[PDB]
Amino acid sequence: NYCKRTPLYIDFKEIGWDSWIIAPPGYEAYECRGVCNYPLAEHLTPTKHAIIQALVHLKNSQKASKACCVPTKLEPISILYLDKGVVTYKFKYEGMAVSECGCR
Amino acid sequence: GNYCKRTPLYIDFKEIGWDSWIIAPPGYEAYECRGVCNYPLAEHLTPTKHAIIQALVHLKNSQKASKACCVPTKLEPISILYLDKGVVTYKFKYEGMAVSECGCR
Amino acid sequence: GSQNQERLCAFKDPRISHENGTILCSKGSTCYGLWEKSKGDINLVKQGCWSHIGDPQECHYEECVVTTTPPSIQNGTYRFCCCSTDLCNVNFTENFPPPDTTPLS
Amino acid sequence: NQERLCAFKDPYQRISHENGTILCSKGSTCYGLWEKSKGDINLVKQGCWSHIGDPQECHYEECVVTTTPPSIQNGTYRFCCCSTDLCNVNFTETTPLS
């Protein structure tokens, strides 16, 4: 169960946001699931802090928590949304979809 | 509440066995990020658009998505003297070592 | 083409130019249109490229087909579709579900 | 905040090579690193030490080796840091009352 990117489909109608987002209907946002255990693999781009905290947790679980599996790179999607009756197109609406997961 | 925030964490290199290669300092205040990320995610936690959306999905269906995680969002360097293949190596600004800011990701 | 992930789309939204009512959509971007429709009244609002990132479901149609029930906003008049063949976004068709069956109808 | 003048030594590196000094940025302390090996004390490095890291090792006015030397190379290294101009040129390591 190591830290990795797993699927997550967002339906804007289900979350109640197609009051303002009118396209797309939804998208593949993904998420990051799984555990970060020392040693932290290089593909999880660990920070020096994450590696140190992970090692402290292994030595003494009461002194520090595990490093956390989180998005480390996000990507833009296209969107149409309404801002007080004005339609706004954005080809690149940043921060919406996970491309990489890591340990932080 | 126990909301996401920076909390104390002292690193003693002898305790983790890194005194073998780190000459100085003997340890330092690394800090850590602890606590929960609750929707709506507070502005000071600098949430990403993805974190906001994931947090909302988790509230509706905790099986579909995990809570947003409290993690370091800005790290600061320390000065260090260490052995790099037996060579004594100085870095004034060894990056990524100490937490200055925590957020929800 | 298919090898280079480029397609030509209709364009309306007064590196890549958009002369003579078309635009090139690269990196696997689909074509999209947005209309607003009320009975026999139809207005084209916008047309152009839709990023592949997030791989939205209905952009897999070869033709521009509205398959999700329109948003309630603006009296349910919006018609968005996106599609994966050249100039597919010149026109749209509707194929969206009817409201579900409840004990009250 | 103060800009320390510090002793400077690093064969593998503003700096006065003529005076063997470095003018450090605001907040930074002076440091020195020696190695006590085979009955010899040898200078390894000297220069600037960042304030960042909650470093209590560096509040002393004089360069004093306070903590039991690191395990590295059989406890031969001698590190100190200090908060006065040129404090890192030298280091120090029954009670005086009996």
Author numbering:
A (entry chain A): 321 to 424
B (entry chain B): 320 to 424
C (entry chain C): 26 to 39, 50 to 140
D (entry chain D): 29 to 41, 50 to 129, 136 to 140
What does the paper say about this structure?
The TGF-β ligands are dimers and initiate signal transduction by forming a signalling complex with two copies of a type I receptor and two copies of a type II receptor; all are single-pass transmembrane proteins containing a small extracellular ligand-binding domain (ECD) and an intracellular kinase domain (ICD). Upon signalling complex formation, the constitutively active type II receptor phosphorylates and activates the type I receptor; subsequently the type I receptor phosphorylates Smad1/5 or Smad2/3 to regulate transcriptional responses. For example, ActRIIA/B bind to and mediate the signalling from both activin ligands and some BMP ligands, whereas BMPRII is the low-affinity type II receptor for over 15 BMP ligands. Of note, BMPRII is particularly highly expressed in lung vascular endothelial cells, where it mediates the signalling from circulating BMP9 and BMP10.
We solved crystal structures of the BMPRII binary complex with BMP10 in two different crystal forms, at 1.48 Å and 2.4 Å, respectively. In the 1.48 Å structure, the asymmetric unit contains one BMP10 dimer with two copies of BMPRII. Using the chain identities to name the seven complexes, they are complexes AC and BD, complex AB and complexes AI, BJ, CK and DL from the ternary complexes. Slight variations in this region among the seven complexes include the lengths of the H-bonds, missing the interaction between BMPRII S86 and BMP10 S398 in complex BJ and AI, and complexes BD, DL, CK, BJ and AI have an additional H-bond between BMPRII K81 and the mainchain of BMP10 V407. Of note, the interaction between K81 and V407 is also present in complex AC, but instead of a direct H-bond, the interaction is mediated by two water molecules. Additional water-mediated interactions between BMP10 and BMPRII are present only in complex AC in this region. The third area is between the A-loop and the F3-loop and is different among different complexes. In complex AC, this region makes significant contact with BMP10 (orange oval), with many direct and water-mediated H-bonds. Interestingly, 5 out of 15 residues with alternate conformations in complex AC are at this area, suggesting that the conformation in this region is highly flexible. Many water-mediated H-bonds are clearly visible in complex AC from the 1.48 Å structure.
